Subunit: 471 residues, 4 copies
């Protein structure tokens, strides 16, 4: 039900935001932030598109219509409904150029809904002031208004956020949340933490607070959004800003506290929370792969190198790369399971491996596409050069191919340039490794699963072939 | 339901065979052949295993019980049942060490009985002498008797097989089939050919003839069976020979010819025949990967290196390789289609990309496992050394670890040796590139599919992101 | 003797230049071009540095002092003197960020000097108006004034530059030179061409003409130089612009013509010309590698991950990468030869292979460094954020390491960002493949050398081991 | 100058030896040992080759003529002369197929005679019982008689060798040396050890004892010599056995102990001892690569695939692999240094990086060659098949190409088979990772060098580009 207009309205709420060397008066209108804010506007609007109601919305138990980003899936086909929703969104929005739209941010909160209690029961030293029902109500609240709750669970390296005081009203926290994406554009900050060896319980904190909370400062890297939307058809659409959040004696009422103290809790449940983001990331990676492969096809075709055998095998490897993501998504969904609350989850082991595959090869694949695109990477016309009466004829002669109009090669060059050769595109590059646990982490925790031990069920085939042990 | 004993008897039919410098009087008993012969006999016997009845057999339309190698699948469920059959055989037989067991050779016959008429329809030099019913009758015959029909299509690179004469009794062919596997162990030779630029119609032959047919000579590489089965538990189980088949005026009755003359037919139909072998190669490939990963886990666990991060990382890498194959299989079965005769076939594009992913990496994955095993690969006790009173105490002290008995290290090493460090193991290495179209072919072939053209459906996302219209 | 001042002066000469959508009135002062122009100014100035006279200059035969960019080397130690010169330059100028300083552009002209005649004698249909002595004088002239002769030999894909008219005064040419680097900043355009299958002799053209020649238009991509030199300590120093050059009925007097017509000539001699640029490129690649490895060291040290074993091996691979370039440079020089004019040339086969090595791996190496640098890639402070009284303390706490001051991590982040995550840095990325023949081309012409044939001297060892042929 | 005949006689000294399950009465004559024994005898004989006198021998200070294995090099020229020796031996002997010929085993002795005193100086449990002169005297002795002294340092992974007793006649040691190569073929065992965390001083032993010493047992892997030398021209030349050596109260006179007790000495001195083996491993590695590239050229030429671009590319890839090794060798010799005793040593960092580059790629390079050979790898005529009247004409038609005789294909295939597809070939595969510190060790070790520290000289370029001072 929420509109881009309401959302844009809400932006101007006093929130304290740096973007580079500058303070931002109003995120909705400031030149450094307005485009990305409009993309979030577009997100809400897209749910009101009449031809999209089938995909974008569903009808809650209470009879109310809600956006699909709050939709629980209890079987495989519902799971696939959820993915069709996420895909549709990222397909409309610059081919997955914006990995943290609110559907991704809020997906994660399905874990609380599914099983609120342990967050309450496992909470150490809050004298039963943490109340599972609070979490549940908060999410319902977020569902009701379509609030965008940016998650922040990543802490500094070896200043972390900590409770400095507790009382009958709530808590006061102080410190920094080291990594956050698009928080300046959100409604709530969703506080979390991951277990680390020797972490203190006053740093074990799960909670929510509005972006404009007194004492909160959002501190973001400089925006790298482009001015000219013809030269930069993608990079001009907004910069999904990354930064940290700073907490100066910030008060959180008990009703927005989710769990405190128990480091035991903080090792499995936070992962349970993030599994949904990990799964989205794979979905996204698949789309980015399909995009890359398509660009390969278009460019090699327009230049006319596509039937050169050495080029063909190169374009196939890009298509294969896409297919490898797709296959892990589909397999994971095929071999999923049910969580405590009965929600259907895709196979964690499989989709994370799908991510490992992406994170291990995406760099080289980008290289292949760029390389295939040759001089059309750096050197091509600006629009005024192309339309100049004296230059235009030389230009059409130099970009004449077997398909489309010559100027099409420039359309393709602009997309490749923005996606892979600009600050804007390169942020997304770097971010791939922060959009969920990174490659080496994925492989490590894999090796923790008991199932991969010597006597474990996985290496059953190996022991038989070697004639070892048994029973 | 044929038995091993019956099979072994069937071998003494006077077929003439070279294994290296030696003619073979009886493949069933010759010291260079008898083990692998026994492996095939074991294959028939597995179907009489009371505890494998459910996996190994099916009851057909007529209440007739038959081996699952003859099972047709019109369902994802059914296909899946066939996979489990193939997998089961492979896990019982030296872990996928025997790539051309009859269940595989006969798999391709499905294509014929699915859609036999165009085979007859399209023949040139016909005279209605080529009859579809003969093709069906033959397979049905092969079915009743559990006949092993080894496929031989691949030709000498740029002397193939050709029709010298054709009367109304049958045809006469001379020439050679360059590559065949275990033909010396089959019952019948399945003749065929692939289209190539400028192929004479007198070389478009699909037929079948017994292995001992007059004018036929099977010419095999030397055998690399190992004598000592303690030292060589796998390599001593027998050598699946490769070689050529020579046809010297070989006569074939019209009852046994399936197509002649039309090289257009040779384009896509022989490929349909082999889609099944390719899919099986993927099944087998994942089993191989599962074994490899298993071994890595056993050896690092037994040595005690398994918890070194940089080691963990590598074992997870191998587990990922397996999950990747499994993902393509499962995904391809999810998104399969129906052939003209109604059989359900997994997505060719996907399962073929799964093979490419394997052919592209197995060499490096194999090296990963070998490196991981250190000296335990190379130097290890022979059995008599182990048991020697003076040596034994030294060997035991040197092979002690956190897991199992010190001698289990020798057991593990022996398997890794046979698999990857012997003539025996290495023929499987080189053979992978011949169990279907090689990696380059897969890649060339996908870029011929029309959907990957600039205006194809595949590039729609990219055309849209670029603001480009086709058409 | 020439100064940056004189050079900057010369810039304002009427030359016709587009940079993006804009016409440039004066390359020396325009905001889009002034920084890179000042870098060329700095180049000339650096030769007047008293402490550098040993390296930057030498004394000609005529007793005159000249810059080392005109210095012929006749033995190994003189060769190494030349490299010490090129290195010194690229070491002073933003760690090899500017691959086409004039020393590189002009190096190539040593091939004419060394052997002028064939250019004259092989010229077809110029009625002996092409005169080797002209080439020689031109170069002397360029040596005398330290002119910067930007080379342009690359033609459009499949508009090329052609002679449209010849006469007693000279020639008129029309067409486009497709790729050119920093031509807007040069003094002369050095025209050339490489042989291609089925190239017409009216397109075989070697010559020189001033940048501001009537009829010449330089058409460059948009400048991506940064405004803020604190946030962007490298990208703010200027953009080495790439573009094409357009010739509208441009007249070249015979005295600046070098060769015409003979396509035979155009297959070996142009390569002979470019060998010097190829060699420089390897020298440059080595420096860029040493830079990357150093950054790896600095960043892993400041964060404190350097002694983590998995990180150590990663930093070593970067150092190894540097060493691989260095080793090819040193070997090539060790095993060099003499050209017709007696100049000492490093081993072509070896240094090109050094380039192949770089071009094949540089993408992954950059990836390794970026990845190693973690969040310091995207998220770090702008200077005003860092110095803010309220933020400064949180910031120093989050960037506290075992070495240097916390703010040092930001210095390192700025360099990594500019070098690998900006339009500016990414141009250099793409350009690596245009700075000499690309990877696949290197490998192809390798396979043309007669020495690599079957009977050739290279595979002598293989024939002996196989017992094949001989004498 | 020792002869082969003398060597073979020397073998029948009653040394006790296991090769697999068998004790060996006379290594010189035993069917499992005699070929490799003959290879060593051939090695001595090469030095009497009249036409190899110049490469194989040198005249020393005293006008004494000696084998180049005993040559000390104080010059780049001299080092280079020694390289040519090593290379020559390798090219005469199955192309580097025998990694542990005596010239290699004895190479490490140079370190002793270069700088013997600290070996004595540093001993603990001394009593001046350990004398440097004995070390020098021994090597000089080994020199006069051309003694093969096999080095054994590597220990059992976490039972090594230990001193039980020490009187004033000598010492008594028990334990086992885990890895040795061709010890059963040597004259003397060269005892040594590497430092490791927490190593008892009674395990710091450097000494030498005859192979047939009482209490010594050489325990070797089964031998994989091939019988038929037509079919197996390389693998039939003999198996360089690997295994362990057991010491059961072995007595060693003080004349023959080189150091005891001090594990600090064990740090960098044993490494100095092996610097020479490592450098030789590089020499050998390039020869191996040269052979591989040679074979690729022969097989693609003979098959006629050699001019397919995508094939050209791959062969150039293999030629590049060879040039890369050659470059590190040549470069490392250019930038070598002088040891304490004055010997000239090539740059360790460089030549060790050359080994890493090899260990990192040889597996994939090997696969490249094997793939390139197609079926010609696997299936090919045995000799008797080739010569058979009926078969012969078929075989010849099938092996015809643009180059050589059709049978040369078989010759090529046989070598590629032995080299990479047999137990014999594969032990060389696995052994590469043991001919010196493995790839991980090389990498770990360079990051210990102080020059790679943040403030080290190496990172100066980067510190300067970042505007950072050290510290």
């Amino acid at each position: 039900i929420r509109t881009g207009k309401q959302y844009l309205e809400s932006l101007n709420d006093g929130r304290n935001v740096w973007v580079g060397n500058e303070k931002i008066d109003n995120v909705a209108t400031h030149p450094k932030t307005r485009d990305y804010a409009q993309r979030h506007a577009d997100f809400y609007d897209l749910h009101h598109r009449p031809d999209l109601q089938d995909v974008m919305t569903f009808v809650d138990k209470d009879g109310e219509r809600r956006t699909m980003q709050w939709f629980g899936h209890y079987d495989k086909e519902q799971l696939r409904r959820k993915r069709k929703y996420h895909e549709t969104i990222m397909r409309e929005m610059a081919g997955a150029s914006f990995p943290r739209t609110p559907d991704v941010n809020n997906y994660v909160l399905q874990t609380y809904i599914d099983d609120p209690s342990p967050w309450e029961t496992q909470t150490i030293g809050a004298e039963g002031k943490v109340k599972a029902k609070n979490i549940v109500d908060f999410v319902n609240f977020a569902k009701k208004h379509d609030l965008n709750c940016a998650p922040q669970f990543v802490d500094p390296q070896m200043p972390g956020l900590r409770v400095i005081e507790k009382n009958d009203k709530g808590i006061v926290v102080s410190g920094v949340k080291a990594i956050g994406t698009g928080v300046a554009f959100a409604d709530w900050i969703h506080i979390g933490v991951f277990f680390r060896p020797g972490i203190p319980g006053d740093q074990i904190i799960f909670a929510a607070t509005p972006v404009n909370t007194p004492g909160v400062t959002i501190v973001c890297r400089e925006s790298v959004v482009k001015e000219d939307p013809i030269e930069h058809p993608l990079a001009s659409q907004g910069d999904e800003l990354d930064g940290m959040t700073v907490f100066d004696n910030v008060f959180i009422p008990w009703s927005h506290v989710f769990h405190l103290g128990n480091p035991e809790h903080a090792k499995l449940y936070p992962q349970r929370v993030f599994d949904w983001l990990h799964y989205h990331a794979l979905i996204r990676q698949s789309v980015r792969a399909e995009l890359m492969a398509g660009l390969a096809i278009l460019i090699t075709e327009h230049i006319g190198t596509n039937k050169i055998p050495a080029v063909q095998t190169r374009v196939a490897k890009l298509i294969g790369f896409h297919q490898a993501m797709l296959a892990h998504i589909v397999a994971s969904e095929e071999l999923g399971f049910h969580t405590p609350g009965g929600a259907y989850k895709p196979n964690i082991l499989i989709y994370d491996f799908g991510r490992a595959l992406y994170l291990e090869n995406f760099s080289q694949m980008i290289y292949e596409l760029v390389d295939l695109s040759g001089r059309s990477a750096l050197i091509f016309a600006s629009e005024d050069q192309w339309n100049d009466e004296a230059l235009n004829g030389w230009f059409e002669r130099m970009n004449n191919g077997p398909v489309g109009q010559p100027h099409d090669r420039v359309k393709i060059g602009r997309v490749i340039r923005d996606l892979f050769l600009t600050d804007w595109g390169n942020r997304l590059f770097v971010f791939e490794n922060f959009n969920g646990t990174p490659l080496q982490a994925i492989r490590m925790l894999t090796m923790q699963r008991a199932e991969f031990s010597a006597a474990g069920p996985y290496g059953t085939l190996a022991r038989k072939v070697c004639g070892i042990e048994l029973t």
